[PDB]
Amino acid sequence: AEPGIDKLFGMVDSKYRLTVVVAKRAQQLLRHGFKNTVLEPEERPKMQTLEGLFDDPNAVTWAMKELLTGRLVFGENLVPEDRLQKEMERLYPVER
Amino acid sequence: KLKAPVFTVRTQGREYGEFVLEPLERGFGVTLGNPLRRILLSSIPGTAVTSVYIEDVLHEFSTIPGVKEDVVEIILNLKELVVRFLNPSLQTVTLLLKAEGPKEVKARDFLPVADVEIMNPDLHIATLEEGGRLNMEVRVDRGVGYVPAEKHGIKDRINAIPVDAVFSPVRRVAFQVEDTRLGQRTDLDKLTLRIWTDGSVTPLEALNQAVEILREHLTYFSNP
């Protein structure tokens, strides 16, 4: 089972809302190369290659583990969409 | 051909260990894990209560006036006593317990003996009431494996009760073999061994002793 899935289902009024939050967050991490993560270095999900341990590349795994920390905010009408996009570009520039 | 495997240890104090050996050539997971398990459960030297005498108790299924437990329960608590011999010379002690009045007898209340350590002194043995008296002598032997009381049947006096002898310091062994790959070697084994002991011997010590017993037995294929 996904780690913490029972708590994740506990956080939302509809299971489909968790999937929307998780997917939008995953897209946000991919867009900004994970620089906007709320995880601390020791909380970062890892993947064991042959060379050694590196960052887990899967942004959905990241997003779920972030949701479980209480450090994300979700809901409807938090902020206009263009203001949010522009502020995230400001704080965490996208690769060119 | 395969590179010597890496041996990985993970311990929690003196009571529990997990041990990991990977990579192994196909099949060697159970080839190593089954003998070592058999040995860890049968041939690691330890100690056990083999006999009990209690003043004014005839047989095992008796009750004790003024003590809350029956004799069965005191013997069960004695089977849980973890005693460690400090001197390889020593082979058997007799530990003595006298107490009375309202009090809860622990394992600490046994009169100490030379080169005899008691790893679990807070272990409950019995509760006594007003006018309750507990006079007992318990025989503690060195040995291996598990011997039912009837098997050894030892008796210093007529009303001494033979006790199932839980010699084994190892309480439980579990192992698992998992497929693993080294590049495009595809059916290699990863052995994970889990060892529970009472604390007198550590898991790691118990394992080193089991591998040593096995190696030693392998030297017997030498001189016809």
Partner: protein, 225 residues
């Protein structure tokens, strides 16, 4: 691993002191699991003879050949003096470690039954309610692993002599052949129409068939459980 042995050698003897029972067992007169009464206790030799302080001790005894998983015994588990088999203790431990909650695990299982389809489905459901889907998924994988392991070495197999034909069968056929003749006579003398004779033969054989089903299963239950 959760069925228990029921034996016939002892056959319900009375004993005064437990040592009389253990001696009778030593002589080969009372089976380890036969129901006896020691001072009207309604116990068995195994429960008196083997008295384990904890699950680890009982399973160590099993590893050494002292008792089998289906032998009924006494074990001290969670401050209780249980009369149960080491296999049912092992099953309790499987649940307990899968779900990492010894108290809830103890509330969840039915300890004094052999585990089968319905009791295992109830366990999965109660676990879902009380512990969530993550722990229930780990419980399910543990049950799978241990069931597969134990079924391998159990000795389950199928030979032609395992389809045991019970004795009663022959009697129930002879009886039937009798009643048929009876019915045939009643038709000869016009007492039954053709349709009635047909319906009665069919009723006879429906009932005989149910009777032999009961006899097959009763034979298994009493002599080859």
């Amino acid at each position: 691993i959760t069925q228990v042995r029921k034996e016939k050698k002892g056959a319900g003897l009375e004993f005064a002191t437990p040592e009389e029972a253990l001696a009778a067992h030593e002589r080969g007169e009372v089976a380890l699991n036969a129901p006896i009464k020691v001072a009207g206790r309604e116990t068995s030799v195994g429960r008196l003879k083997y008295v384990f302080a904890n699950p680890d001790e009982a399973l160590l005894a099993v590893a050494h050949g002292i008792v089998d998983l289906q032998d009924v015994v006494t074990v001290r588990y969670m401050g209780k003096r249980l009369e149960t088999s080491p296999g049912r203790i092992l099953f309790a431990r499987i649940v307990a470690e899968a779900v990492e909650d010894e108290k809830v695990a103890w509330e969840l299982i039915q300890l004094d039954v052999p585990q089968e389809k319905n009791s295992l489905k109830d366990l999965v459901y109660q676990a879902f309610l009380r512990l969530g889907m993550e722990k229930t998924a780990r419980l399910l994988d543990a049950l799978k692993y241990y069931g597969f392991t134990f079924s391998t070495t159990s000795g389950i197999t199928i030979g032609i002599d395992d389809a045991v034909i019970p004795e009663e069968k022959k009697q129930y056929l002879e009886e039937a052949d009798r009643k048929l003749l009876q019915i045939e006579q009643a038709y000869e003398m016009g007492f039954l129409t053709d349709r009635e004779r047909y319906d009665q033969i069919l009723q006879l054989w429906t009932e005989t068939t149910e009777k032999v089903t009961q006899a097959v299963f009763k034979n298994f239950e009493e002599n080859y459980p």
